[PDB]
Amino acid sequence: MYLRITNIVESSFFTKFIIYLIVLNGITMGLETSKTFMQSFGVYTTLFNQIVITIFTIEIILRIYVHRISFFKDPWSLFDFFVVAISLVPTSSGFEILRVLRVLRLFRLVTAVPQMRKIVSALISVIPGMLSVIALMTLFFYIFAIMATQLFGERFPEWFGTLGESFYTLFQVMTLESWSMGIVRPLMEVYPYAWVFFIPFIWVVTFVMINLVVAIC
Amino acid sequence: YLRITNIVESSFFTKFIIYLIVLNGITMGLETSKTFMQSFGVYTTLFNQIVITIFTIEIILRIYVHRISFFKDPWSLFDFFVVAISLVPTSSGFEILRVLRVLRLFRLVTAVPQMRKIVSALISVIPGMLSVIALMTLFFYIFAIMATQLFGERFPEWFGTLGESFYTLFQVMTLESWSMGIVRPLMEVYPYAWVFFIPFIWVVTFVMINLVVAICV
Amino acid sequence: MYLRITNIVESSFFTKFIIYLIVLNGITMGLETSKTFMQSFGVYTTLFNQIVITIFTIEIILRIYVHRISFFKDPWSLFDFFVVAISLVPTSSGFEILRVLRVLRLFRLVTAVPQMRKIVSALISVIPGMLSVIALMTLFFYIFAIMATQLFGERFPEWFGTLGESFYTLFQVMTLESWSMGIVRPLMEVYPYAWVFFIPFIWVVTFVMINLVVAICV
Amino acid sequence: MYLRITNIVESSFFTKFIIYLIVLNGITMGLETSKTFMQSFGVYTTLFNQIVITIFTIEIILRIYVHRISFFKDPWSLFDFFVVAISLVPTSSGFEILRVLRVLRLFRLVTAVPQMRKIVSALISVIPGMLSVIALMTLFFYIFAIMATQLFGERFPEWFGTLGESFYTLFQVMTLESWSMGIVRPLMEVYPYAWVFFIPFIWVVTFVMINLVVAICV
Ligand SMILES: CCCCCCCCCCCCCC(=O)OC[C@H](COP(=O)(O)OCC[N+](C)(C)C)OC(=O)CCCCCCCCCCCCC
Ligand SMILES: CCCCCCCCCCCCCC(=O)OC[C@H](COP(=O)(O)OCC[N+](C)(C)C)OC(=O)CCCCCCCCCCCCC
């Protein structure tokens, strides 16, 4: 019976049939947005949702027995399981994030399609040469998130009153979004030397980011 | 057949068309001034009717001379569509067409071969990005769904609609007011909103850098 | 008698002394910012300023006769000449812009110092391969500045009421600064399809900028 | 007994022991943030702080005599020394900034870890080929900070009323953050040709940044 199932799984019709349910339930998940649509075809949708998430469990089961241990060493296969299991976590009795993360079952399209795999693998190959840099940045953020908290968190609780709130504000300053008019110009109305903290932080952070972009080449 | 071919391929012919381009280009840019259009309104719309008439003749001649070679030249197809657009009556129809008359000034890139190379150099890059662009669009689509059914209830203006989420997420991609404008307000209601957007901005930026590196290398 | 002046001009003390006055009047121009300073040492500065423009008038004369036609064919010399001539325009009579552009005489440090010339020339060397691009962008902006004017200049005069006014706003959209919350989101409350105009405009403009960066890196 | 200290210092446990205390007081320094935490283990922390900074004094002492002058020629060692010396400055005497700069002793992890040194040295190595440009950038800012001050600092003191205020605003304009809606659009409502000042300033500043990136590329 194994060889019987093995032929169905690895057939091109099988893979194509899975892509069919993705693009369908992908559309099906995207019309659950419209409250108007949900009045007419609300029942049509949730069933097909349960239908598709059920079939993908079957498909992911066959891929196991066909590949055995080879299945649970394939990231694209493990992804599917978690991403199907998320969709399998009960519809109710819990935070709606799980019902939302059910839409992650639409990322399953990159698994079924090999052309996307090449795009994805090409990018992840860059991550190795960047952990040397990312780690340094995180220590830099952590050291300065400490300083900003015990510097400005007294008069500015919403931006720096908490080690975490300082982290959030500092990432925004990195992105440069309202760093001056939004945060530093007001900060300077109380601490006039605040620019000594943030201008070099922007200098340093930008220089490193540029090096990382150049590092990739 | 040979009679028209000499007129069409004469260098004055090419030069004469560029003259009307730079003329109607100026002429189209003076239709901006309400002052100018009160005195010389007739002189211009006639000159527009004059120019659109000559360009119809010009676009006719190049057809019979090249036959299928005309409708296989992208630079020629552009001219045809963009002149045909301008031919829809000035008042009959949505006034949008009267605006799209200004697209006939891009025909200068067609008429000039030096521009053709610059434009072709950039469009030639798009192929190596459709493999990537498509992935980006899928990423946007999955998150536009999540953001919609997460924040669209209390925030209809930004996420109440699958389309509105797309706009906001492209805005967040551009980093414009993403924090003080969008996420900070969301966090006043959903304190874990930063878990949604900080990794999103990471992914969006990471792919953009990879796209730049691909073009540079 | 001619060759006598030629030795002084190209002497290293001469070259160094001008830089001495550059960094001097450069500092002197930067204390004219302080209203406090200008009450006590106003004469000390404007005189030293008048002193500097006098010596720099002399120096720019000497370099001419020594170089003859080579002076008015050396951009760095023409620059000096124009930038000192600006400083030579009378202190009064005329727009104060000239008194401000007198501070351009501090750019004279880039001419006098040769190491900067290479740094500057390294940047200008990039300009040739980009005029092919800059020109297209200007045509791209001009076509869209027209549309924005005759699209939104009716209900939105301060952003698009004028072909020039449209140029400014569109340049802002290029920088992505407040393009959405500032311009497109308000426009959409009046013209709901405004995003069809500005979202791709950003795409093309950004795409071209990226290619330009890649072009320079190669 | 010169060789006696050298073996302990050069032991891998010695290097590892310092790295352990870095990551420890690093956590401890980040728990001094919570006002809640400081009520329970506040004393436990301030004691542990004095403990750690005392041990790091010992370590920085041993490495000296073992290395003699070689210690004060090692940047990574000088850093450790200076950054520990800060923590030795009295806890309450002087501005509380000193109590904050105690957290810089967590950058000593980049020193203590050799894998980081290569990354950091790789980045600092880029800075030399940029001082040719960085200096030019600084002069450009300096010349324009003066002009903006005596142009817009009169009606707009908060952004340009002071040579320093102009510098900050110009760096703000450089970062492009609210450069248009925040600074130039208000400026133009009073000085309508203010855009002639800032649009090319942005062009040059933006153009140089790419060249700086290209400098990093080449
Ligand atoms: C020397 C190198 C190794 C250092 C690694 C140590 C990482 C953690 C050290 C101490 C950080 C946690 C202590 C802390 O200040 O957290 C409490 C703050 C203050 O708020 P608090 O007054 O305590 O009220 C509770 C607020 N709540 C619910 C958000 C927790 O509330 C918060 O903000 C909680 C969030 C703190 C988590 C910080 C995560 C940064 C880790 C960076 C290290 C790299 C990780 C890859
Ligand atoms: C991405 C960086 C590109 C290259 C750097 C660009 C050139 C650097 C010039 C920008 C300097 C930062 C602007 C600034 O904050 O100037 C402030 C100080 C004096 O201000 P001050 O009046 O004392 O502060 C009170 C006024 N307030 C409250 C409104 C700020 O003004 C000064 O004290 C003069 C400081 C001159 C800066 C020295 C040049 C350092 C170049 C750093 C290179 C960065 C490497 C990527």
Short mmCIF file of N, CA, C and O in Angstrom, two decimals, chain C residues 2 8 23 37 44 57-58 64 89 111 114 155 164 181 209 214:
data_model
loop_
_atom_site.label_atom_id
_atom_site.label_comp_id
_atom_site.label_asym_id
_atom_site.label_seq_id
_atom_site.Cartn_x
_atom_site.Cartn_y
_atom_site.Cartn_z
N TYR C 2 58.02 91.34 -14.96
CA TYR C 2 56.86 90.45 -14.93
C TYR C 2 57.14 89.20 -14.11
O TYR C 2 56.35 88.81 -13.25
N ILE C 8 56.33 85.10 -6.42
CA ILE C 8 55.59 85.33 -5.18
C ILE C 8 54.27 84.56 -5.18
O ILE C 8 53.91 83.93 -4.18
N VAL C 23 40.69 80.44 6.80
CA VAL C 23 40.28 79.91 8.10
C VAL C 23 40.09 81.03 9.10
O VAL C 23 39.31 80.89 10.05
N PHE C 37 28.45 89.14 20.43
CA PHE C 37 29.77 89.45 19.87
C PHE C 37 29.72 90.71 19.01
O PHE C 37 30.63 91.55 19.08
N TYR C 44 35.96 95.13 14.95
CA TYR C 44 37.04 94.15 14.79
C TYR C 44 36.75 93.16 13.66
O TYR C 44 37.66 92.74 12.95
N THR C 57 41.16 90.48 -2.96
CA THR C 57 41.12 91.20 -4.22
C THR C 57 42.51 91.23 -4.86
O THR C 57 42.66 90.96 -6.06
N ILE C 58 43.52 91.57 -4.06
CA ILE C 58 44.90 91.57 -4.54
C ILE C 58 45.31 90.19 -5.05
O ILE C 58 45.81 90.05 -6.17
N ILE C 64 45.97 86.17 -11.94
CA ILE C 64 45.59 86.40 -13.34
C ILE C 64 46.83 86.63 -14.20
O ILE C 64 47.13 85.84 -15.10
N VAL C 89 30.88 92.90 -4.15
CA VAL C 89 29.66 93.69 -4.33
C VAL C 89 29.48 94.54 -3.08
O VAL C 89 29.61 94.02 -1.96
N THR C 111 39.15 75.39 -2.98
CA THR C 111 40.09 75.68 -4.06
C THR C 111 41.53 75.68 -3.56
O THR C 111 42.40 75.01 -4.14
N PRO C 114 44.47 71.35 -2.09
CA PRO C 114 44.38 70.40 -3.20
C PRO C 114 43.75 69.06 -2.84
O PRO C 114 43.11 68.45 -3.71
N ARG C 155 -9.25 72.27 -5.68
CA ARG C 155 -9.55 72.13 -4.26
C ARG C 155 -8.32 72.22 -3.37
O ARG C 155 -8.47 72.39 -2.15
N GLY C 164 4.42 75.22 -10.79
CA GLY C 164 5.56 75.21 -9.88
C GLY C 164 5.19 74.62 -8.53
O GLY C 164 5.95 73.85 -7.95
N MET C 181 0.11 60.70 4.87
CA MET C 181 -0.62 61.45 5.88
C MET C 181 -0.75 62.92 5.51
O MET C 181 -1.75 63.56 5.87
N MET C 209 15.81 55.93 -8.85
CA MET C 209 16.83 56.26 -7.86
C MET C 209 17.69 55.05 -7.51
O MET C 209 18.91 55.17 -7.40
N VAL C 214 22.91 51.94 -8.23
CA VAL C 214 23.62 50.79 -8.80
C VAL C 214 24.55 51.23 -9.92
O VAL C 214 25.68 50.75 -10.04
#
